[PDB]
Write a protein that binds this ligand. Structure first.
Ligand code: HEM
Ligand SMILES: *[C@@H]1O[C@H](CO)[C@@H](O[C@@H]2O[C@H](CO)[C@@H](O)[C@H](O)[C@H]2NC(C)=O)[C@H](O)[C@H]1NC(C)=O
Ligand SMILES: *[C@@H]1O[C@H](CO)[C@@H](O)[C@H](O)[C@H]1NC(C)=O
Ligand SMILES: *[C@@H]1O[C@H](CO)[C@@H](O)[C@H](O)[C@H]1NC(C)=O
Ligand SMILES: *[C@@H]1O[C@H](CO)[C@@H](O)[C@H](O)[C@H]1NC(C)=O
Ligand SMILES: C/C=C/c1ccc(O)c(OC)c1
Ligand SMILES: [Ca+2]
Length: 595
């Protein structure tokens, strides 16, 4: 066994039993073991961590040491050989809107974050890793293979630092290293409100007693709000353009400004919250600040649950959706709602769905201006193209009228992310999201592909012919084999994503199984699930049953023409209808008859 509960960083676990609202930290959801699904605790291990030394080291740390008799391939070599492609033609998913990709990143953020090791204060370590590419302690550089273009213009490696782990920040033994999930495992709208009280309050507007979320005072969007700027220096949003000097936004989740479209979706959320607190004020004028905030927060987290589970998940899982997420049967206190470590990798499937460009569209959904279509890499940490360039309404149109990239066996990840990714405190648009993912798998001591195949009640190929038959691809199988030398060594991220898509779905069997379980666990282990009897009133539930993303757009943007089904591909003007004919969220069921 292990020390039953290592817990030096998490002390305070005091719970109010009457409380009708979720805590910001996730704590007190589970009564028998409150810390389940709470921010700042270890990610769950569905299977024992697999580490080079069986403690904290990652495979590929010691050159001599092999995994199952073979050396594991360099993350970047796998990337170049398998992940990359040149031709962006015929790569768009015909039946998925770009919103599909976007919602997947939103939901993912709400659920898990495993941030890097924070051990360098007035230290050159972030630069000693980057400048001289020397692996040590938390620094775990992604080295370039022999034939690599980036070797010629960038250096010997790409900087990479290991993720944070519970108890000691830098040293520990002998139990296996466990990474931290810095957000709440629950689909609770954390990304809008925060997972810490320190952040939660800063995000709030406590000046007025209207329970509104703090907005921007330096800029507006045709009378509509923008999230507040985060005034911390240095900002990468200012670094990308030093002339525009527009900093990153401040949201409930740290990563909000990574790409313009996510920041965009973050802006749509804050608005719907403020819009909700204003309607509650009008029907319940006796309700105070905190109460207006909490009830609005309660409704938004319910909205994210319905969209994700009713509209989003069935089109990710497709045929495999009932097999894993059968109709709700109520809260089950024995269900672990913690995000597992492997899900933070299973969910990365979304990377394949990211297209190489983003567009801006006018009322007739036509190119908005001369540069309307821009390359994705010019949008990493770019908040200025929203403030100084037309607001969100044009971007929210792109999201409805354009397509997500379709995952493709010979075209998995676009170069915008493969070669051109920007990372804070590193200057260049010259990083690789694919290499990073694979590096992270090893950093998190991930079990190989077959361990996971076995875990899901699926076959475990040991030959080239076996792998060919599972992937339904000769050449993909051969490249993987030549690199890994065995399936048993294939990193889960590239292994799960290499499998053909399930019928009516956008992922393979292995991912549909992993994604499948996790989502059902976060629905069943949630005491505050919107459908759990007693959370909302019988009537409130009938009002919430009508929410839509279309409605979220109409309610919080000046667009008046939207599809009925926001995630499927939709063309203008045919697939578009007026906002007038769209179900509204009636808030009458929230009337507080106190007298
Ligand atoms: C830029 C990036 C994106 C869009 C242009 C993007 C998009 C997605 C989608 C669509 C996802 C799911 C449907 C998704 C999931 C997860 N991501 Fe990814 N993402 C961009 C960039 C990054 C970067 C950089 C990281 C950090 C990777 C690391 O190991 O350091 C990243 C991570 C993740 C992630 C793991 C979250 C966690 O638990 O830490 C997903 C589950 N994304 N992204
Ligand atoms: C930096 O941001 C500035 C300011 O928004 C961008 O400047 C503008 O872009 C074009 C000119 O090419 C004009 O439409 C705007 O009027 C410009 N504004 C100003 C103040 O010059 C500039 O293009 C951005 N630069 C980079 C490298 O991203
Ligand atoms: C598109 O997806 C929807 C589900 O989101 C489905 O009902 C429809 O049949 C699909 N269209 C095609 C051509 O497969
Ligand atoms: C707080 O709310 C008041 C009243 O609506 C508003 O005037 C003020 O601008 C808000 N402050 C912030 C920082 O959002
Ligand atoms: C509750 O979870 C337990 C443990 O996973 C499971 O055995 C049981 O079937 C669940 N209860 C219901 C009503 O589904
Ligand atoms: C801010 C930095 C950042 C932004 C978006 C991400 O997805 C991420 O990786 C977990 C880090
Ligand atoms: Ca959460």
């Amino acid at each position: 066994s292990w020390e039953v509960g290592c817990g030096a960083p998490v002390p305070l676990v005091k719970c109010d039993e009457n409380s009708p609202y979720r805590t910001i930290t996730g704590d007190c959801n589970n009564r028998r073991s409150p810390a389940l699904g709470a921010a700042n605790r270890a990610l769950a291990r569905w299977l024992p961590a697999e580490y080079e030394d069986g403690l904290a080291l990652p495979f590929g740390w010691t050159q001599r040491k092999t995994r199952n008799g073979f050396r594991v391939p360099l993350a970047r070599e796998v990337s170049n050989k398998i992940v990359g492609y040149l031709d962006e033609e015929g790569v768009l998913d015909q039946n998925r809107s770009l919103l599909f990709m976007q919602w997947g990143q939103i939901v993912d953020h709400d659920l898990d974050f495993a941030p890097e090791t924070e051990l360098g204060s007035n230290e050159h370590s972030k630069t000693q890793c980057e400048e001289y590419c020397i692996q040590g302690d938390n620094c775990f550089p992604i080295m370039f293979p022999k034939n690599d273009p980036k070797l010629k213009t960038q250096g010997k490696c790409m900087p990479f630092f290991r993720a944070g782990f519970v108890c000691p920040t830098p040293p520990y033994q002998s139990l296996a290293r466990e990474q931290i999930n810095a957000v709440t495992s629950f689909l609770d709208a954390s990304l809008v409100y925060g997972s810490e009280p320190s952040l939660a309050s800063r995000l709030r507007n406590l000046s007025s007693p209207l329970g509104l979320m703090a907005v921007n005072q330096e800029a507006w969007d045709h009378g509509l709000a923008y999230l507040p700027f985060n005034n911390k220096k240095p900002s990468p949003c200012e670094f990308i353009n030093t002339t525009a000097r527009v900093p990153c936004f401040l949201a409930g989740d740290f990563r909000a400004s990574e790409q313009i479209l996510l920041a965009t979706a973050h802006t749509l959320l804050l608005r719907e919250h403020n819009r909700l607190a204003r309607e509650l004020k009008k029907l319940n004028p006796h309700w105070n600040g905190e109460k207006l905030y909490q009830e609005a927060r309660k409704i938004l987290g319910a909205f994210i649950q319905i969209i994700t589970f009713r509209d989003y998940l069935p089109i990710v899982l497709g045929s495999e959706m009932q097999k894993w997420i059968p109709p709700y049967q109520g809260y089950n206190n024995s269900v672990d709602p913690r995000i597992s470590n492997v899900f933070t990798f299973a969910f990365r499937f979304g990377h394949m769905e990211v297209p190489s460009t983003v567009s801006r569209l006018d009322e007739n959904y036509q190119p908005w201006g001369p540069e309307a279509e821009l390359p994705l890499h010019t949008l990493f940490f770019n908040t200025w193209r929203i403030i100084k360039d037309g607001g969100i309404d044009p971007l929210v149109r792109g999201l409805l009228a354009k397509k997500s990239k379709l995952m493709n066996q010979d075209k998995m990840v676009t170069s915008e992310l493969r070669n051109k990714l920007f990372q804070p405190t590193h200057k260049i648009h010259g990083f690789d999201l694919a290499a990073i993912n694979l590096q992270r798998c090893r950093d998190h001591g991930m079990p190989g592909y077959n361990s996971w195949r076995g875990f899901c009640g699926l076959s475990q190929p040991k030959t080239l012919k076996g792998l060919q038959t599972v992937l339904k691809n000769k050449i993909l199988a051969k490249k993987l084999m030549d690199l890994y030398k065995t399936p048993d060594n294939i990193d889960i991220w590239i292994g799960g994503n290499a499998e053909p898509m399930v019928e009516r779905g956008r992922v393979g069997p292995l991912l549909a199984c992993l994604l499948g379980r996790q989502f059902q666990q976060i629905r069943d282990g949630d005491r505050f699930w919107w459908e759990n009897p007693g959370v909302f009133t019988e009537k409130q539930r009938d009002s919430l049953q009508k929410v839509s993303f279309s409605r979220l757009i109409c309610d919080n943007t000046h667009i008046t023409k939207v599809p009925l089904h926001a995630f499927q591909a939709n063309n203008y003007p045919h697939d578009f209808v007026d906002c007038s004919t769209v179900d509204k969220l009636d808030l009458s069921p929230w009337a507080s008859r106190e007298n």
